[PDB]
Design a protein around this ligand. Structure first.
Ligand code: HEC
Ligand code: HEC
Lengths: 125, 125
């Protein structure tokens, strides 16, 4: 869907920004600093689920740029493993949200955050 | 969810970028220059539905900036009318996609695009 590699960079940066806001805005809730409304969190995690699937298709062949470390395309199976582990951790977060359980939400949120950090460490300049 | 107004600007720009890619990438399909796969388009419109709901909450009080024309907050009912008409046109596009009908898709796509342009004309610097 991208006329030039810069368009893919633009897209993935935007997706990651949006995905990130939807994750991070829950931090006060998991810490107890903001109230827990199960329906609110269910709805937000549904948004995050959708967003979480979007960046990866914008690291397609020929789309080097931005802050993507070069190690993304040359180790494609390993990068995939990574987004799929993150993507699996998101499934867990959805299950916790859909079940209305703040303890399960806290644990799932932490494992998502660890997966963000793992990919960041390997693949972000 | 925004610590400073700049964060809301950042978010809405990203949402609009993403929403826009999901709309615009269908242009070759509606024109017949790319093949029509009903399932592909259904899935893409589902993404666009989710995205289409996101920008508006990031024009909250105190979030002047970016290319938002000042006329957004002082005429709040009219701006709302506008996003809700766009939002209603998106419902129509979802119905066309879910029904697998390229003629209905073409018509609905055009009315969405007109609604994008209408808000752009009134409210984007
Ligand atoms: C690899 C499988 C990743 C996972 C999982 C997550 N992120 Fe990431 N992120 C990744 C890359 C390779 C990049 C650079 C993209 C580019 O081309 O520049 C990023 C970037 C971000 C950004 C900055 C976006 C921008 O506006 O430029 C943010 C805010 C970000 N990532 C956040 C983030 C969060 C919160 C994640 C888990 C919920 C997450 N990322 C996962 C690679 C990967
Ligand atoms: C008002 C109800 C709008 C509708 C409907 C659409 N857009 Fe728009 N758009 C609007 C504003 C006020 C702005 C400026 C935001 C800011 O603070 O700068 C925009 C901006 C865009 C952009 C640029 C985003 C960026 O990266 O800076 C794009 C690509 C865009 N809008 C596209 C777009 C499309 C394709 C729409 C229909 C599918 C659409 N917008 C609707 C206001 C409104």
């Amino acid at each position: 869907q991208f006329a030039k590699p810069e368009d893919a960079v633009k897209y993935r940066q935007s997706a990651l920004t949006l995905m990130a806001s939807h994750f991070g805005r829950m931090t006060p809730v998991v810490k107890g600093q903001a109230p827990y409304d199960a329906a609110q969190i269910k709805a937000n995690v549904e948004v995050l689920k959708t967003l979480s699937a979007l960046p990866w298709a914008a690291f397609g062949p020929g789309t080097e740029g931005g802050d993507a470390r070069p190690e993304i395309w040359s180790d494609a199976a390993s990068f995939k493993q990574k987004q799929q582990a993150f993507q699996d951790n998101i499934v867990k977060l959805s299950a916790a949200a859909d079940a209305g359980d703040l303890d399960k939400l806290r644990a799932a949120f932490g494992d998502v955050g660890a997966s963000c950090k793992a990919c960041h460490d390997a693949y972000q300049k």
